[PDB]
Amino acid sequence: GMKLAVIAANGQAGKAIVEEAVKRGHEVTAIVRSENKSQAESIIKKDLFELTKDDLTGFDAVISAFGAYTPDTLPLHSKSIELFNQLLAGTQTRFLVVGGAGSLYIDETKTTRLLDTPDFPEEFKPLAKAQADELDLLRTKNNLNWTFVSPAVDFIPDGEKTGNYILAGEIFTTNEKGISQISYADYAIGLVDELEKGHHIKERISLLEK
Amino acid sequence: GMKLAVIAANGQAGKAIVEEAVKRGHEVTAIVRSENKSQAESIIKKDLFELTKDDLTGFDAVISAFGAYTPDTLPLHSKSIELFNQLLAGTQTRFLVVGGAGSLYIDETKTTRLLDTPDFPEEFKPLAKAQADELDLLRTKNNLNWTFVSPAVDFIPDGEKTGNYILAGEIFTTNEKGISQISYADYAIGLVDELEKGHHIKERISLLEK
Amino acid sequence: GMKLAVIAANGQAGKAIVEEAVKRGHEVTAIVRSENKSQAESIIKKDLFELTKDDLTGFDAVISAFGAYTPDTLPLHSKSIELFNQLLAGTQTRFLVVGGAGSLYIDETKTTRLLDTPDFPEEFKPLAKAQADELDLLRTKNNLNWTFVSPAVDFIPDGEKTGNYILAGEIFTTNEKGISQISYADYAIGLVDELEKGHHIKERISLLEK
Amino acid sequence: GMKLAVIAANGQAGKAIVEEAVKRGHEVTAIVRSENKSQAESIIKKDLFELTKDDLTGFDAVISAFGAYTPDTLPLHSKSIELFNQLLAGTQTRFLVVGGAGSLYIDETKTTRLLDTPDFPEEFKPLAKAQADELDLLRTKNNLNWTFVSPAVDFIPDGEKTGNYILAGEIFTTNEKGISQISYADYAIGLVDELEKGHHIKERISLLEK
Ligand SMILES: [Cl-]
Ligand SMILES: [Cl-]
Ligand SMILES: [Cl-]
Ligand SMILES: [Cl-]
Ligand SMILES: [Cl-]
Ligand SMILES: [Cl-]
Ligand SMILES: [Cl-]
Ligand SMILES: [Cl-]
């Protein structure tokens, strides 16, 4: 039994994690901006960047499922990291981030990331860059127990809950079909598994179907 | 002349469509979130999902160049089909969608699509599958005069405007030199031609430069 | 300890299998056209299509690594099957074929094969088609204990012997990197494993690295 | 005028090269396996691997458009480099190779190549890697005046002959409209231009239509 806080729990990914974590038996606090649509026990209706340490004290882990509402608010991904670091560094609390797949390295050389390939679609670049900047900023946070959780390339909100996912690392990975996809449901399962049985501190993991 | 409404007329695709339609002497209304940058002289400042039945009445045809490019919003392609069907079913108003080439069939059996083949780039799959689910759902709407207009595999924004294009059906098609290519401007000529010379009602067509 | 015959043992794939099988301790007969370069025990210098039943009697399994020397002799792949069937059908002897990857199905629907995709390179089609026709002819051989062994897409003669391969089935498969490659050495290992520990009778298996 | 030898002059690439070179008034010798179908007026009926040092003497430049397209023969790209180096090292005879676009670097760091990216089609990898190993080995030959000439990603046989092309270096380059395209005829103009205006000795260059 853990006490978890989920930022932006009204988001599609956020409530996916809430619903999964609740099912596991953990007591979940939803930190939201509007009325709570999630299955969460307690609600803190507050603006993300107005959070204090006293808001995040008394949690085993804090999971940010923050997603920029507008393209000009995309830089808030980085500002959120800076904020959360200010609030959680020094403490032993875990800070998990629902990340992007664009920042995954293409191979073991770890010189180029998916984001940087000539064929990476223009319309994805703004979010992918913000999520990449987000991850780059986390690596400089020495006294923060962070874990960046990259989803698959194809991340599907109401995708089928298969129950069978693959845990990978810093490098882009596919299943046996050469495909990189995962549902929000299966992703939540993998993320909560890393909460219950979590090796990976101050590093990024990745999740995918099958 | 006809009376046309274009959703997302500020985008590159929609704007090329509006500009082509206007110089041919059509009455064009732009349905956009922000300031109208297209050559449409009539504006309706709403997004799709609050358009009423009255908003879309009195039009000869409605062209959706709508786009969404985040994991959360990618399913809005199909959800927009639900909306537009609700607002236009029963009426004889034509409904055209700017689609993708990924859903095109590789051969005459019409089973395997381009996005199904192992050489189809993984990074193109989020958008391709979203647009494919869009077409799949659109085929259901039997009380809607729909036309899905797939571009070429290389859909070039701001590409050279050649006067020539090839109209094909549901099968993936290349020109005499074997390439699948079309600029936005040429695609616009093809789409508007289809509006002026209506044939393919409740059908998917494809366009490519000759 | 098995008694194996390898057709075209002087070929790069052929001697790969011979050298591997010899190492395992089996007694290998090389059926070749010129001087024996393989490590094989006994040699039958004879033209393939002049083989008789008395040439192939007294073998636990016969492995054909036949490769067409000229593009106009590519149809000999099919003729070889017809010949081997005539020689081995009725007997309990296993007949393994070093096949191609082009005939692998793209997905579970099993309607389209890699060979048939729009992007499959023209220069590969003649061999791929002959190897596909080869496999199609085998399926009609009811009283033949055949096993078609497809290699990976990238099949490399002097590739590194990793020792770690994946056994797959009728459907195209990749490793965790989304890559389909294998060395001749690793392929030989997998093929001889199917000889020693062989489930798969009257069906096709596929092999690949990692 | 110059004295040129072209290996595999019967192939589509080599023939376009020979035809371009001849009409410019160069003395062209075709080194081919079979009857010379190119416009070369001098013929040497051998394949590469039996050419002697005397066979390749007295030429200003030697252009290899050699191709191999089976798993067994694909490594002959690199083996031909060994041969041609043996026959031409020490001499000041230029040696040009018709290469591939797959080995082109994606950015200025010159690490990741196109064939290294996860979107690079799996079916193109056998030939791309073979040609990449070819370039890698060719860089070793310091006593050889070599020039590797990469085409565009879309190398169109029998494509339209536009008078315009873009010469680039080792970095993957697209034109103003963002496409990477070149016909055989345009590539031939570029290659022959390089012969007439020698600059890039011991270098890899790339060509694409403007
Ligand atoms: Cl689904
Ligand atoms: Cl890793
Ligand atoms: Cl505005
Ligand atoms: Cl059709
Ligand atoms: Cl190797
Ligand atoms: Cl299977
Ligand atoms: Cl001849
Ligand atoms: Cl350069």
Cross-strand partners of D183: D156
- Among candidates D109, D114, D116 on the partner chain, residue whose Cβ is nearest the Cβ of A107: D116
Q: What is the rounded radius of gyration, in angstroms, for the C-alpha atoms of chain D? A: 16
Q: What is the DSSP-derived secondary structure letter of residue B105?
A: B
B119:C116 CB<8 A: no
Which residues of chain C neighbour D33 with C-beta distances below 8 Å? none
- In Å, how far is A120's CA from the nearest CA of chain C? 17
Which residues of chain D neighbour C11 with C-beta distances below 8 Å? 72
Q: What is the rounded radius of gyration, in angstroms, for the C-alpha atoms of chain A? A: 16
- Yes or no: say if B203 and B144 are a contact pair by the CB < 8 Å rule: no
Q: Are strands A181-183 and A154-156 parallel, antiparallel or unpaired?
A: parallel
- Say how far apart CA A127 and CA A68 lie, in whole Å: 8
Residue of C10, C22, C12, C43 lying closest to C192 (CA atoms): C22
Number of domains in chain D: 1
- Say how far apart CA D81 and CA D138 lie, in whole Å: 6
- Say how far apart CA A16 and CA A40 lie, in whole Å: 11
**B122 interfacial to chain A (CB closer than 8 Å):** yes
Instruction: State the angle between helix axes of B76-88 and B125-138 in degrees (0 to 180), rounded to the nearest 10.
Output: 20
**A38 interfacial to chain B (CB closer than 8 Å):** no
Chains interfacing with B (3 or more CB pairs < 8 Å): A, C, D
Amino acid letter for position D49: F
A173:C176 CB<8 A: yes
For A54, A130, B14, the CA distances from A81, given in Å and listed in that order, are 17, 11, 37
- Say how far apart CA D40 and CA D42 lie, in whole Å: 6
What Å resolution does this PDB entry report?
A: 2.4
- Yes or no: say if B184 and B155 are a contact pair by the CB < 8 Å rule: yes
- Among candidates D118, D158, D179 on the partner chain, residue whose Cβ is nearest the Cβ of B122: D118
B119:D121 CB<8 A: yes
Q: Token digits for D209?
A: 């239509």
Q: What is the DSSP-derived secondary structure letter of residue A200?
A: -
For ligand 6, the distance from its centroid to the CA atom of residue C192, given in whole angstroms, is 20
A178:C178 CB<8 A: yes
Which residues of chain D neighbour B179 with C-beta distances below 8 Å? 154, 156, 181
Q: Token digits for A47?
A: 């603006």
- Yes or no: say if D73 and D91 are a contact pair by the CB < 8 Å rule: no
- In Å, how far is B124's CA from the nearest CA of chain C? 15
Q: Which of residues 138-167 of B touch A (CB under 8 A)?
A: none
Experimental method: X-ray
CATH number of residue A30's parent domain:
3.40.50.720
Cross-strand partners of C209: C165
HEC string of chain D? CCEEEEECCCCHHHHHHHHHHHHCCCEEEEECCCCCCCCCCEEECCCHHHCCCCCCCCCCEEEECCCCCCCCCCCHHHHHHHHHHHHHCCCCCEEEEECCCCCCECCCCCCCEHHHCCCCCHHHHHHHHHHHHHHHHHCCCCCCCEEEEECCCEEECCCCCCCCEEEECCECCCCCCCCCEEEHHHHHHHHHHHHHCCCCCCEEEEEEEC
- Among candidates C111, C117, C172 on the partner chain, residue whose Cβ is nearest the Cβ of B111: C111
D122:B122 CB<8 A: no
Amino acid letter for position A150: S
B121:A119 CB<8 A: yes
B106:C114 CB<8 A: no
For ligand 2, the distance from its centroid to the CA atom of residue D172, given in whole angstroms, is 28
Q: For the residues of A53-69, what is the DSSP string, one character each?
A: HHHHSS-SEEEE----S
Residue C49 belongs to domain spanning: 1-210
Q: Token digits for A143?
A: 């006294």
Residue of B91, B90, B81, B100 lying closest to B7 (CA atoms): B81
